Amino acid sequence: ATLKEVEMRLKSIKNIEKITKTMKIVASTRLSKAEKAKISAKKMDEAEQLFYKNAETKNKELIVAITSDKGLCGSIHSQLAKAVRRHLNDQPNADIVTIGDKIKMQLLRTHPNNIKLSINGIGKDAPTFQESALIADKLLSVMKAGTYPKISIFYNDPVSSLSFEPSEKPIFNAKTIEQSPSFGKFEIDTDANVPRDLFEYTLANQMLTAMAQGYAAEISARRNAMDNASKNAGDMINRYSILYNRTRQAVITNELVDIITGASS
Amino acid sequence: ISYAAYLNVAAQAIRSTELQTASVLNRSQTDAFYTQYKNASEPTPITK
Amino acid sequence: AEYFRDEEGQDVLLFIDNIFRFTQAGSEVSALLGRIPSAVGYQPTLATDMGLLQERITTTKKGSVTSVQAVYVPADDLTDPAPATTFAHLDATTVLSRGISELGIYPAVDPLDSKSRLLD
Amino acid sequence: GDRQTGKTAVALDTILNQKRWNNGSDESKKLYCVYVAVGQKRSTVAQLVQTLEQHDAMKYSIIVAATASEAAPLQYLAPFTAASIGEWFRDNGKHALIVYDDLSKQAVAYRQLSLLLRRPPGREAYPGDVFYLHSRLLERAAKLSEKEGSGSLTALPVIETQGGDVSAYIPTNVISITDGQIFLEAELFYKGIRPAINVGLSVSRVGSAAQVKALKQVAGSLKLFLAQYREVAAFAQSDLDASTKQTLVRGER
Amino acid sequence: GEWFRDNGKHALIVYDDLSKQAVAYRQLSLLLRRPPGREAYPGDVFYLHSRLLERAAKLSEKEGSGSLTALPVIETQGGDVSAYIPTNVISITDGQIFLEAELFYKGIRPAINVGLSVSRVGSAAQVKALKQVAGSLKLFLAQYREVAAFAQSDLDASTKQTLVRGER
Amino acid sequence: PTNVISITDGQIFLEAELFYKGIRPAINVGLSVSRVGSAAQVKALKQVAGSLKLFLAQYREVAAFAQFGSDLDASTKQTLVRGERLTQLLKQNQYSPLATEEQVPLIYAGVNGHLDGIELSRIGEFESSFLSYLKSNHNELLTEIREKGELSKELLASLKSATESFVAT
Amino acid sequence: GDRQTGKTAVALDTILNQKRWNNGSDESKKLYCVYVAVGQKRSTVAQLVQTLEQHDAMKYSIIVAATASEAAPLQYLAPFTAASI
Amino acid sequence: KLQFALPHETLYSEVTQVNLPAKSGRIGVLANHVPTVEQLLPGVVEVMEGSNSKKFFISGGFATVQPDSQLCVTAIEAPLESFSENIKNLLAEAKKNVSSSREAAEAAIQVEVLENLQSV
Amino acid sequence: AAVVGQEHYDVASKVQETLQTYKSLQDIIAILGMDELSEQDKLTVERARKIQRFLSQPFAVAEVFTGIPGKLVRLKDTVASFKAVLEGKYDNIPEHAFYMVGGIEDVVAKAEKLAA
Amino acid sequence: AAVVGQEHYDVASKVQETLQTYKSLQDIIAILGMDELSEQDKLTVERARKIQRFLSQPFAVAEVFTGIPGKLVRLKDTVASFKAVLEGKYDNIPEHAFYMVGGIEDVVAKAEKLAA
Does any CB of chain C come closer than 8 Å to the CB of residue D108? Answer: yes
Residue D205 touches partner J, C-beta closer than 8 Å:
yes
- Give the closest residue to J107 by CA, choosing from J86, J85, J87: J85
User: Rounded to 5 degrees, what are φ and ψ at A62?
Assistant: -110, 150
Please tell me the distance from the alpha carbon of residue H36 to that of residue G19, in angstroms, as a whole number: 95
C-alpha span between D74 and D37 (Å, rounded): 12
Nearest CA in chain A to J30: A232
Compute the distance between CA of residue J98 and CA of residue G24 in angstroms, rounded to an integer: 57
G3 is in an annotated binding site: yes
All residues at 6 or more sequence positions from B34 whose CB lies less than 8 Å from its CB, including other chains: A117, A118, A119, A120, A135, A138, A142, B45, B46, B47, B48
- Which candidate from E39, E82, E154 shows the least CB-CB separation from A29? E154
- Any idea what the CATH number is for the domain that residue D158 is in? 3.40.50.300
Let me know: does E56 contact E13? Beta carbons within 8 Å: yes
> Quick one: F42-169 is in which CATH superfamily?
ATP synthase alpha/beta chain, C-terminal domain (1.20.150.20)
Query: Judging by beta carbons within 10 Å of its beta carbon (0-12, 13-18, 19+), is residue F11 exposed, middle or buried?
Result: middle
Separation between Cα atoms, residue D129 and residue D110, nearest integer Å: 9
Chain E residues touching I28 at Cβ < 8 A: 152
Interchain contact, J36 vs A72, CB within 8 Å: yes
3-state secondary structure E37-100: CHHHCECCHHHHHHHHHCCCCCCCCCCCCCCCEECCECCCCCCCCCCHHHHHHHHHCCEECCEC
Strand ranges inside chain I, DSSP E: none
CB D48 within 8 A of CB D37: yes
G2 appears as a binding residue in the annotation: yes
Helix (H, G, I), strand (E, B) or coil at D29: coil
Angle at which helices J39-54 and J75-86 cross, to 10°? 160
Residue D164 Cα distances to A251, D4, D140, D234, angstroms: 19, 12, 28, 20
Question: Which among A172, A174, A173 is positioned nearest to A194, based on CA atoms?
Answer: A174
F122 carries an active-site annotation: no
Query: Which 3 state secondary structure label does DSSP give G37?
Result: strand
C-alpha span between C13 and F131 (Å, rounded): 90
Query: What residue numbers bound the domain in which D105 lies?
Result: 1-211
Strands, DSSP E only, in B1-48?
A: 33-36, 46-47
- Name all chains with 3 or more CB-CB pairs below 8 Å to chain H: A, B
C-alpha D73/C-alpha D70 separation (Å) is 9
Nearest partner of D105 among D69, D68, D136, judged by Cα? D68
Q: Of F100, F81, F86, F110, give the one whose Cα is nearest residue F151.
A: F100
Answer for the pair E165, E140: CB distance below 8 angstroms, yes or no. yes
C92, with CB counted inside 10 A (0-12, 13-18, 19+), is exposed
Amino acid letter, residue D235: F
Angle I75-87/I6-31 helices, nearest 10 degrees? Answer: 50
Number of CB pairs < 8 Å for A and F? Answer: 6
Report how far residue J4's alpha carbon sits from residue J79's, in angstroms, rounded to the nearest whole number.
10
Contact I88/I70 with Cβ under 8 angstroms?
A: no
Please, are residues G63 and G35 in contact by the beta-carbon 8 Å criterion?
yes
F16 touches G: beta carbon within 8 Å: yes
Cβ proximity of H55 and H44 under 8 Å: yes
What are the structural domains of chain A? Answer: 1-25+226-265 (1.10.287.80), 26-225 (3.40.1380.10)
Does residue B6 sit at the H interface (CB-CB below 8 Å)?
Answer: yes
Domains of chain I plus CATH, in order, are 1-116 (1.10.1140.10)
Contact G5 F28 (CB under 8 A): no
> Who among G2, G13, G55 is closest to F16 (CB)?
G2
Residues E117, F33: Cα–Cα separation, whole Å: 43
CA distance linking residue D73 with residue D111, whole number of Å: 10
Instruction: Tell me the resolution in Å.
Output: 4.4
Which strands make up the sheet holding A94-99, listed edge to edge? A163-170, A151-160, A61-66, A94-99, A115-118, B33-36, B46-47
Domains and CATH numbers, chain B: 1-48 (1.10.1620.20)
Which residue among the candidates F35, F82, F122, F146 is catalytic per the annotation?
A: F35
Chain D stretch 219-238, residues whose beta carbon is closer than 8 A to a beta carbon of chain J: 220-221, 223-224, 228, 231, 238
Question: Do residue A16 and residue I31 have CB atoms under 8 angstroms apart?
Answer: yes
Cβ atoms of C47 and C26 within 8 Å: the answer is no
Q: Which of J34, J35, J40, J42 to mutate to test the interface with A (most CBs of A within 10 A)?
A: J35
Rg of chain I over Cα atoms, rounded to whole angstroms, equals 15
- Dump strand ranges (E) for chain C: 14-18, 67-70, 92-93, 115-116
CATH topology assigned to domain H1-84: ATP Synthase; domain 1 (2.60.15)
Contact A33, A126 (CB under 8 A): yes
Count other C-beta atoms under 10 Å from residue A264's C-beta: 11
Cβ-defined contact of E43 to C32 (cutoff 8 Å): yes
> What letter represents residue J32's amino acid?
L
Question: What burial class does residue I25 get, using C-beta atoms within 10 Å of its C-beta: 0-12 exposed, 13-18 middle, 19+ buried?
Answer: buried
Ranges of each domain in chain H: 1-84, 87-119
* Helices I6-31 and A3-54: angle between axes, nearest 10 degrees: 60
SS3 content of chain F, % helix, strand, coil (to 5): 60, 5, 35
Angle at A46 between CA A42 and CA A49, to 5 degrees: 135
Tell me the backbone φ, ψ of residue C109, rounded to 5 degrees: -60, 135
Backbone angles phi, psi at A115, to 5 degrees: -70, 115
Between CA F162 and CA F168, with CA F165 as vertex, the angle to 5 degrees is 135
CB contact under 8 A, F70 and I31: yes
Phi, psi of I53, rounded to the nearest 5 degrees: -100, 0
Residue type, E98: F
- Secondary structure (DSSP) of D42-56: HHHHHHHHHHHHHTT
Helix (H) / strand (E) element for H55: namely strand H52-58
Please tell me the number of Cα atoms within 13 Å of H17 on its side-chain side. 11
Instruction: Using CB atoms, pick whichever of J34, J65, J96 lies closest to residue D238.
Output: J34
Partner-chain contact H90 B13, CB within 8 Å: yes
In sign, the C-alpha dihedral spanning F26, F32, F38, F44 is positive
Distance from CA of J31 to the nearest CA of F (A): 10
Q: Which residues pair with D97 in a beta bridge?
A: D33, D154
Contacts of A23 (CB under 8 A, 6+ apart): A222, A226, A229, I32
Q: Tell me which residue of C70, C82, C69, C75 sits closest to C26, measured CA to CA.
A: C82
- Do the bridges between strand H43-49 and strand H52-58 make them parallel or antiparallel, or are there none, so unpaired? antiparallel
In 3-state terms chain B splits into helix, strand, coil percentages (rounded to 5) of 40, 15, 45
3-state per-residue secondary structure call for chain A: CCHHHHHHHHHHHHHHHHHHHHHHHHHHHHHHHHHHHHHHHHHHHHHHHHHHHHCCCCCCEEEEEECCCCCCECEHHHHHHHHHHHHHHHCCCEEEEEECHHHHHHHHHHCCCCEEEECCCCCCCCCCHHHHHHHHHHHHHHHCHHHCCCEEEEEEEEEECCEEEEEEEECCCHHHHHHCCCCCCCCCCCCCCHHHHHHHHHHHHHHHHHHHHHHHHHHHHHHHHHHHHHHHHHHHHHHHHHHHHHHHHHHHHHHHHHHHHHHHC
Q: Measured between CB atoms, which of J31, J33, J39 is closest to A105?
A: J39
- What count of other Cβ atoms lies within 10 Å of the Cβ of residue E63? 11
Residue in B4, B5, B35 nearest the CB of A118: B35
Instruction: Collect all residues of chain E within an 8 Å Cβ-Cβ radius of residue C75.
Output: 81-82, 87
CA R_g for chain E: 21
Contact (CB, 8 A) for A206 and A51: no
| I78 shares contact with chain E (CB less than 8 Å) | no
Q: Any long-range contacts for E119-122 (C-beta under 8 Å, 24+ apart)? A: E119/E94, E119/E95, E120/E94, E120/E95, E121/E94, E121/E95, E122/E95
In chain A, residues 169-198 whose CB comes closer than 8 Å to chain B? 196-197
3-state secondary structure of I75: helix
F141 in Cβ contact with F159 (< 8 Å): yes
Whether the CB of A25 is below 8 Å from some CB of chain E: the reply is yes
Nearest residue of chain C to residue E46 (CA atoms): C28
Does residue C107 have a cis peptide bond before it, meaning omega lies within 30 degrees of 0? yes
Report the DSSP beta bridge partners of residue G36: G64
Chains in contact with B, where contact means 3 or more Cβ–Cβ distances below 8 Å, are A, H
Burial of E150 per CB tally in 10 Å (0-12, 13-18, 19+): middle
Query: What is residue H8's DSSP assignment?
Result: S
> Which of D208, D220, D238 minimises the CB distance to J64?
D208
Residues of E acting as catalytic residues:
120
Helix, strand, coil content of chain G in percent (nearest 5): 50, 15, 35
Is D125–A253 a contact, with Cβ atoms under 8 angstroms apart? yes
